[PDB]
Protein: Nitric oxide synthase
Amino acid sequence: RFLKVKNWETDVVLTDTLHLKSTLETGCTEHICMGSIMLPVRTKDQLFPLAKEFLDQYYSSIKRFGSKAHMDRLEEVNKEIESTSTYQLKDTELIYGAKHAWRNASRCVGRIQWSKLQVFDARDCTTAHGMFNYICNHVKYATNKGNLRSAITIFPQRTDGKHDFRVWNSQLIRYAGYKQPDGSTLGDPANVQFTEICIQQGWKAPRGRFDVLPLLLQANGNDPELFQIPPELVLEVPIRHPKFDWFKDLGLKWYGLPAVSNMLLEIGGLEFSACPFSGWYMGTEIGVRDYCDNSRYNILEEVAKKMDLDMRKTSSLWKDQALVEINIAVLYSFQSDKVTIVDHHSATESFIKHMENEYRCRGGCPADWVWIVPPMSGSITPVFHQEMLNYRLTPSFEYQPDPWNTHVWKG
Amino acid sequence: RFLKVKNWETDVVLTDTLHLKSTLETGCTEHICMGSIMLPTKDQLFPLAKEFLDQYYSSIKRFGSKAHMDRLEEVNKEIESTSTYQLKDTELIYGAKHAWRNASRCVGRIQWSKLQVFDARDCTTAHGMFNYICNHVKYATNKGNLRSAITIFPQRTDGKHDFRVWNSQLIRYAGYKQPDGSTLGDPANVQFTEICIQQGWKAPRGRFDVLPLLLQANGNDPELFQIPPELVLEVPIRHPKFDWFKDLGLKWYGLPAVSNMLLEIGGLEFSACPFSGWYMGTEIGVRDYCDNSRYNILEEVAKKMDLDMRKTSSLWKDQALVEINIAVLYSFQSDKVTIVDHHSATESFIKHMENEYRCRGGCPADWVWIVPPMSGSITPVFHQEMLNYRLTPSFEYQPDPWNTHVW
Ligand code: HEM
Ligand code: HEM
Ligand SMILES: Cc1cc(N)nc(CCc2cccc(CCc3cc(C)cc(N)n3)n2)c1
Ligand SMILES: Cc1cc(N)nc(CCc2cccc(CCc3cc(C)cc(N)n3)n2)c1
Ligand SMILES: C[C@H](O)[C@H](O)[C@H]1CNc2nc(N)[nH]c(=O)c2N1
Ligand SMILES: C[C@H](O)[C@H](O)[C@H]1CNc2nc(N)[nH]c(=O)c2N1
Ligand SMILES: [Zn+2]
Structure:
């Protein structure tokens, strides 16, 4: 079975066979496409096959499929499962799994980098204090004084779902949001609810516009504990504009390290519920979404005001003009401070090269167009005209519900 | 069974039930989403007729009435005897409006009920077709105050007597491959232009030559006609701030009129059904002007603005893109030719979608096409979950005639 994707700018046509290895489901049917829906404990029984497909993939990749070492490993894992209802990954398999979850992440435009990922094995961690230490080391290593390096830290896997390791923060580094009695927000509206939890847990909120949130860390199903990342580890960039001298007086900054900390890494049926991972930013994540979403910092008006754009009619494209200037500012600031960042032209062009290479070497590259296309200037990037096939491969990153909704408080 | 869509900007949640009345297939499966793919008998006909007439009589609040049963009976008798049937004028108008209403990729559907339907089912020759089309064009243009219109030529019979407009739009510019190696005019139309030349068209070989119509009646060989130039309203493109802009020699036509699609109503197939509205600015300024495989003007404009084109990260493409789109909108507005910007159009669509949810139980929408090709996330549609499904009546793609036609 073969599936073809066309690029409508280049007429380049690719053939996907990889989708035949797809296990998980999409949410779509022959009658309904759910392609724009944001969010569409295992038995021994289900675990054996999952482990086996994983180990088959792993041993093929090292050109050892069907070897004695492959067979012995299957036998050993099977025995471990029947006897203990679960199993332990070798370090090599963990590394491979983590790299593959990234490689398989169809919503990630940054996948050209998938094979350079530093894996920190934190499966010997037992306490929230232990977690804090691992996370500090990850932050320092990944930050690398502005010369960012991709990394993931992997905490112990789920057992009975009652002893989960979780990082309650959605990202390791994020700014607090405070709902004011007059209904306005100070700082980042995205993080109001989590900020409230931190405050309730005893965090002394400075109540500024750019307060780095404390880490809220849960080990072994215990109640989460608050920790402050050492400020000297939190690299930040003041935002200025190359031509507009008043831009700095907007008082904007952002942090350099994007580190997603609330997803679940699934490898060979095992579930790693705390697996913070980090890379570097594409400029639009900050300049389009973080700054210009109406539900976020929402700075478009103020920027357009200072530029004295005609704001009486939308058809002046004042929003669009301000949007570009903000995004220029973000890239210029990160570059000037030597903090790794990639523009959306460069990221999408690299992604297209990655995608074609993946088709050639792997038989496919699952990709979610809705997410891959940048949130500004969509059609002047090469991904816009690229047909993509979206399907779900394992290993994978998955969403999980926010822990404050599910946690059984011990007291 | 009942499906929820969330807006991530406003937290508003809508419940879709309309998808259960879905009847065509999406191309997707539980294993693979094809969301981003551009183009994924008597016995068959009666269910299709019944389905349609049920929705029609329901709409005029006469479901299960004698007039309903009688028409169902009438159409059935017509099919068994003739192997097809004819729509009443009222049914035709209902069907056409609903094909638009159901167009999941159309952002402008708030307008769906205000569609002027021209019944050209009495047409028999390519000459008749040309007359009907000039009239549509003049009506729709309305000296710049544009009005939505569709013109419906006779339905398919045995498939050997198809009416087709060979053009993809009623008004488009020619494309010519040059000894130079580059393309003159619109590169999207090079194959069609050559077909026009090989049919006898005297091509002026300019950058903006309005293509002639190539009309096929009753399955006959297609004939050429030039639309009266006085009926083709065009707009010279200037910028409100940059005086050099006009020097690029850019213009575009006022009337977007898609002419190559197939209208399907109650199993009947209208293979020639040109329809028109008015432009959203980005269609011209982003796609027509800036696509690499179209007029591809970004480099020239960036140059004139004296932007630093050394590095992608200066966002010179993005800067030029915005300016090109300001010029488009400015030029149309100044010349009083109806146009909508992507902010206004997407805001309207959100309002339409909420109307459709509360009055119909849903609104099929294809996010990939609805989100504008520039500034996506600063339009409300970006943050709106949409369910995409296929309802009938509908507009469908069909193979280009030069592949299908037997000469
Ligand atoms: C190296 C630099 C990277 C860049 C520039 C990059 C870029 C991006 C961007 C722009 C998004 C969409 C984000 C949004 O709109 O919220 C994304 C999504 C994602 N990335 Fe990356 N990425 C990078 C590295 C990584 C790494 C190291 C991992 C994991 C090891 C990763 C896994 C993911 C996943 C799982 C998603 C989508 C989440 C979902 O399914 O909703 N990426 N990437
Ligand atoms: C009146 C103002 C209208 C506006 C502003 C508008 C807007 C648009 C836009 C921007 C597109 C995307 C086109 C592209 O990217 O190539 C589109 C698609 C489409 N529109 Fe409209 N439209 C209008 C009127 C109409 C009318 C009158 C009809 C039919 C009666 C129609 C039916 C369609 C269909 C079928 C598609 C998508 C074709 C496909 O499936 O690929 N629209 N619309
Ligand atoms: C359910 C849901 C709701 C919502 N509003 N947002 C999300 C997105 C969460 C997420 C996942 C992966 C990457 C990023 C964006 C952050 C990021 C991470 C890395 C590793 C690199 C990079 N350039 N950027 N953000 C999910
Ligand atoms: C074969 C094929 C290939 C391809 N790459 N794209 C297409 C799209 C055809 C099409 C359909 C509807 C509207 C428009 C865009 C033109 C248009 C039409 C109307 C009625 C209003 C408006 N504002 N704009 N264009 C077809
Ligand atoms: C591959 C992808 O489906 C293709 O580029 C689409 C994307 N979205 C689009 N959206 C609109 N409105 N019009 C288009 O022509 C396209 N092209
Ligand atoms: C409704 C829609 O799926 C949602 O707004 C998506 C669209 N595309 C996106 N793309 C990226 N990269 N990030 C996002 O948060 C979103 N949001
Ligand atoms: Zn789908």
User: Anything to note?
Assistant: Residues 234-256+279-344 of chain B form a domain with the Bovine Endothelial Nitric Oxide Synthase Heme Domain; Chain: A,domain 3 fold (CATH 3.90.1230.10). The pocket of zinc ion (ligand 7) is lined by residues A 28, 33-35; B 28, 33-35 (CB under 6 Å). The radius of gyration of chain B is 23 Å.
